[PDB]
Design a protein around this ligand. Sequence first.
Ligand SMILES: *[C@@H]1O[C@H](CO)[C@@H](O[C@@H]2O[C@H](CO)[C@@H](O)[C@H](O)[C@H]2NC(C)=O)[C@H](O)[C@H]1NC(C)=O
Lengths: 49, 49
Amino acid sequence: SETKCTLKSFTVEKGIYQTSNFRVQPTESIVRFPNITNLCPFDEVFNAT
Amino acid sequence: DCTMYICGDSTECSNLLLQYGSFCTQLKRALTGIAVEQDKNTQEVFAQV
Ligand SMILES: *[C@@H]1O[C@H](CO)[C@@H](O[C@@H]2O[C@H](CO)[C@@H](O)[C@H](O)[C@H]2NC(C)=O)[C@H](O)[C@H]1NC(C)=O
């Protein structure tokens, strides 16, 4: 039925008829960045004596 | 692959590409004509026995 909708006909004669495609989607969205990172001690300004 | 060459993975693109009509069908039909003739070229030169 996909072949008949590709040809826009109801009769499909003999032969290979390249139709759709075939990709294999992913699953994991594995992201990444750097181990790094200083912090800026708000702590000091939010805890001064 | 017309969709994978132009858009490339993205799926928001596929709905936009459908708005240009049958340009991707024309590319597949044109290239299939070449693909079938290239095997016939070889049969006509060598398969004479
Ligand atoms: C705000 O400052 C106080 C004092 O410097 C911190 O209290 C210390 O907390 C650590 C771990 O919680 C303890 O090991 C220390 O003995 C504590 N010191 C004192 C004098 O109590 C408090 O943790 C600071 N706030 C934050 C969010 O770090």
